[PDB]
Design a protein around this nucleic acid. Sequence first.
RNA 1: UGACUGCUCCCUAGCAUGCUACUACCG
RNA 2: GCGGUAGUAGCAUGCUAGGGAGCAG
Lengths: 207, 100, 187, 186, 72
Amino acid sequence: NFNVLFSTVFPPTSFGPLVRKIFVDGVPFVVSTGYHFRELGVVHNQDVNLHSSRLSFKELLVYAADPAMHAASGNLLLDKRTTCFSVAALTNNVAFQTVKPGNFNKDFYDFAVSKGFFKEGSSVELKHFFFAQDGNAAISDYDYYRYNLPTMCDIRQLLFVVEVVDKYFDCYDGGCINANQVIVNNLDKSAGFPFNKWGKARLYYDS
Amino acid sequence: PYPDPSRILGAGCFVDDIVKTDGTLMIERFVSLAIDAYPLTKHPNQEYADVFHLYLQYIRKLHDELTGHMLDMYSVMLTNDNTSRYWEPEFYEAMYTPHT
Amino acid sequence: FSSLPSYAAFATAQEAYEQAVANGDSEVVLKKLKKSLNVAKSEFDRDAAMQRKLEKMADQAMTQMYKQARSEDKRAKVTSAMQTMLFTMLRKLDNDALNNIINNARDGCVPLNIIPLTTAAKLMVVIPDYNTYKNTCDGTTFTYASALWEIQQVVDADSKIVQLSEISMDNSPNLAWPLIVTALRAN
Amino acid sequence: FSSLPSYAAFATAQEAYEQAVANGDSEVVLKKLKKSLNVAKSEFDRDAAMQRKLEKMADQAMTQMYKQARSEDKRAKVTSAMQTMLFTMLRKLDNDALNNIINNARDGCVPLNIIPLTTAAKLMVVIPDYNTYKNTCDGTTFTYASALWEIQQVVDADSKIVQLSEISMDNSPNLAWPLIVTALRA
Amino acid sequence: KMSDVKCTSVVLLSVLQQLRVESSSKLWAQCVQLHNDILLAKDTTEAFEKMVSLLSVLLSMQGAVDINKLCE
RNA sequence: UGACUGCUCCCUAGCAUGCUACUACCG
RNA sequence: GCGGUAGUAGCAUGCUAGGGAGCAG
Ligand SMILES: [Zn+2]
């Protein structure tokens, strides 16, 4: 709570990951090794290996899912569309993405009017349509975060409302489970940024 | 718990992809939409109830047209039914009485 | 299913049963033909009734291990790709100005959101409209992050080229408007 | 279904045992005429349900293949389904506004920019011959989209803005026809 | 008459978008603008004016070959 | 470009259980 | 005689997995 206040005063180009050039097989990369949150202060890694002749598979993973390599290798970016602190850029041409309209299903429509629907004056009336959007909708929608401010919350009553909420959640039970009892429905849904060039969650749930 | 007549109608008329369109291929949507558009039948206002009955007659048309349609280019078609449960309400009614 | 061991016993016994029907002797002939048959069928009770579940189990397990070999080749493909991506995306790290700005820190730790802001060798600034265009990337040079930048090309929505002569107030409303200026780091 | 050999065997078994239960005889014949029937009834009413399953499976697999063929066409002719659906919907829709501009665009008067709707902004048009022209064109007004555009220019192909007053039916056979008879909202 | 108008605008915008009118930016911006202004219109004359405006976007090209297409 | 989670219908496959008859073989 | 158990079909229930589609936040 306190850090949430005392961390407006400082600059905002000094939050985020840290980094440090590590040398793998006598080659240098950059890799995250901590964080600096606006609340939980500084937080240092604990298993950083200043060298390595070979990275395994778990490694390769947690190094290609990181911002540090992508960002630290990309052209600067200044974005005058938003207020949110941009950071870097990857491509050379920005991409503008749009949304198409629906499709009409005519035969249901004629069959719907035959029974006498859509008489001008009725009480049922088309209203839910497939709306379209132009080019820069993605980012003019991302922008809405500028409704999110730093907030201090009162504390001597948060430390009581948290008791009572916990009391609500009391009849239940839980714990860590092992990697052979998890359940995952629908195993062909995308895997997010750095990985969705190679396949869906399936492929990374096998290998 | 009933929905919103405009919602059900709208979802009937506007689809994504030209395959959702053609109905015969996808008689499996209209069944679910009719499962959701049932409690409107007991409603007081009128045109509501007509939504349901529209949906039932529409499934009937879809089927009994697909069947003959595929009968011709064939030289037979549907012989064993009890699809006839799809277009009468005593199927859709099971799902709102407490037993399963 | 047509070449099992006890098949031969069955064949002889029931060919003999039919030889006995060919002679057609006593009722004890029926006693024979009816204890032989039933016992010889009590054979296939087991032969072509168990090995037929054995083949189920066999081909089943075989197909499972086929699927497994597939997955295990996929692992190799993904690893090779991820690796070559890293070892081609590192080479542009600009290993000089970086080398400086690290080797000066208290210990290697330098927040990420400044590595590009002080070492990147190309800006790309996106402008919504003209009135904001002036109050930054005007002319042929501007300054931002306090290094000296110099414009060198401008595109727009449809990705084409306009000459910096055209971006006035009058010729403005014919410009696919989110012009995207691509500068360079001038010393 | 009586076209399987199993049906033949069961037929003769039923037949003989029926004959014997009718005519009447000892127990031995009909115990033989039960271990000569029930085995046949078995070897029948097993395959004669196996096959009734098979044929149904056949019908369903063929209907599924039909669905797939129908689809992999219908998602390959949108480019014309959409268009024809559109123009039938317009003809049904019907309006002097619409119908007017549609006839015209069937002829020549095909705009170059959105028909505005303000009582100020301009528009353009691409007349060809003197006729369609003269039907719409008159003095200083250009009625169109059920609206009164009043002219404020007139040009030609390589843009030698001629006047208007020159144009009749005989003198006009001497001008780069494809005008762009600009105008403004009434 | 209303709901007919909304639905014909939908099919209209789609047939445009098949002609790559989504690759001229501000063109596609005006289109999208109209076609959501209709779908929300409560009267039924605003709908017709926005419609004829939208249609003009289509006629002005050479793809949607009208003459034949209106074979009647 | 296709997020997490919950409920529901429909069509195949497999297992179990029972239900099932006809054959068996033994007491 | 009555049961035994074993193979064969047939039906139901349930569980599994894979497939298609719909709704809610
Ligand atoms: Zn834990």
